[PDB]
Write a protein that binds this ligand. Structure first.
Ligand SMILES: CCCCCCCCCCCCCCCC(=O)O
Length: 155
């Protein structure tokens, strides 16, 4: 069936973040540990065990993830790109009824605004990505830009 309202997968993200923070607290402490009393390291370990077991409880009621829902978790940038590309094709698919409704020009206008806004966010992201990810990040934004252009060219 057609795309539905996005599944709330926040419980999964929360478990991941909780475990991530507990692991980080341990890494900060262990790397600075020289010798002597290690009670605080054992406490860090206990916090991590509890975060893990809390995850077992937190996710006990979650239905299985679909392919798309799993990607939303594992590869959120890829998920977003996929959903944007879907939006573009879905829009192009409705060109005829949109024109029959009198909205063809307005859609083209809106797409030109999407294009300009996307360009601006893409520029900003290019300044925040580490140098070794510059090309892969640009490839992703260029792909979206090309999609928006396809939309514009259809209206
Ligand atoms: C009413 C028409 C709506 C058409 C929606 C399809 C166009 C979606 C474009 C969203 C661009 C999101 C910005 C991405 C910025 C970036 O690449 O970093």
């Amino acid at each position: 069936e057609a795309t539905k309202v996005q599944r709330d997968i926040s419980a999964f993200k929360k478990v991941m973040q909780n475990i991530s923070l507990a692991v980080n607290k341990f890494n900060v402490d262990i790397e600075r540990y020289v010798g002597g009393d290690a009670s605080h390291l054992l406490a860090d370990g206990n916090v991590l065990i509890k975060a893990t077991l809390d995850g077992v409880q937190s996710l006990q009621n979650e239905p299985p993830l679909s392919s798309m829902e799993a990607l939303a978790l594992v590869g959120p940038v890829q998920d977003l790109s996929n959903q944007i590309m879907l939006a573009i094709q879905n829009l192009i698919d409705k060109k005829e009824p949109l024109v029959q409704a009198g909205f063809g020009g307005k859609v083209e206008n809106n797409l030109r605004q999407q294009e300009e806004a996307a360009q601006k966010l893409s520029e900003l992201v290019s300044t925040k990505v580490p140098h070794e990810l510059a090309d892969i990040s640009r490839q992703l934004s260029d792909g979206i830009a090309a999609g928006i252009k396809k939309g514009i060219d259809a209206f």
